[PDB]
Amino acid sequence: SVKSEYAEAAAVGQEAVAVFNTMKAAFQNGDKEAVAQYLARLASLYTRHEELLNRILEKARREGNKEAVTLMNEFTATFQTGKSIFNAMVAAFKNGDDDSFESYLQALEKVTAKGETLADQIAKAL
Ligand SMILES: NS(=O)(=O)c1ncc[nH]1
């Protein structure tokens, strides 16, 4: 079902949360080799999450589930904010700009925390 596809998508999102929090610790500790690997892992996780979300939205559209479409449009918009901030964080790591990396890190944390009430609303709507 679309609801079980959303449970799979949620789990991938939680995997990225876990990897992110480990990466944050590695960044603080100066373990740049670990950070590089975690950023690669996060890129794959976000790419996969984005795809699962698009399939969920497309299915809700085909089902005529107007409320779920509305919530998923808002949620997919917020996802792209996080993706842009993530990608900027990656560039800051490449460039050795630790000040920008810290900045983007906190921003990605706040954008993600903000979107959690909507994430729970979607589960109930599908
Ligand atoms: N936790 S998150 O939803 O922003 C996510 N999923 C994949 C990469 N990042």
CA distance 73 to 61: 10
CA distance 115 to 109: 10
User: Which mutation among 14, 49, 118 tests ligand 1's pocket best, with the greatest number of atoms within 8 A of CB?
Assistant: 49
| DSSP class of 96 | T
Q: Are 122 and 72 in contact (CB under 8 A)?
A: yes
User: Which mutation among 15, 46, 110 tests ligand 1's pocket best, with the greatest number of atoms within 8 A of CB?
Assistant: 46
* Binding pocket residue ranges, ligand 1, CB within 6 Å: 12-13, 16-17, 42, 45-46, 49, 82, 112
Query: Experimental method used, please?
Result: X-ray
Half-sphere exposure of 13 (CA within 13 A, CB side): 22
Quote the ligand 1 centre to 17 CA distance (angstroms).
7
CA distance 126 to 113: 21
Q: What is the CA radius of gyration of the chain?
A: 16
Q: Are 116 and 69 in contact (CB under 8 A)?
A: no
Contacts of residue 119, Cβ cutoff 8 Å, sequence gap at least 6: 10, 13, 75
Quote the ligand 1 centre to 126 CA distance (angstroms).
20
Helix (H, G, I), strand (E, B) or coil at 25: helix
Residue at 71: amino acid letter:
L
* Resolution rounded to one decimal, in angstroms: 1.6
Nearest CA to ligand 1 atom 2: 13
- Token pair of 53 as six digits: 């979300």
- Token pair of 71 as six digits: 């919530």
Alpha helices in the chain (DSSP H): 2-29, 32-63, 66-95, 98-114, 116-125
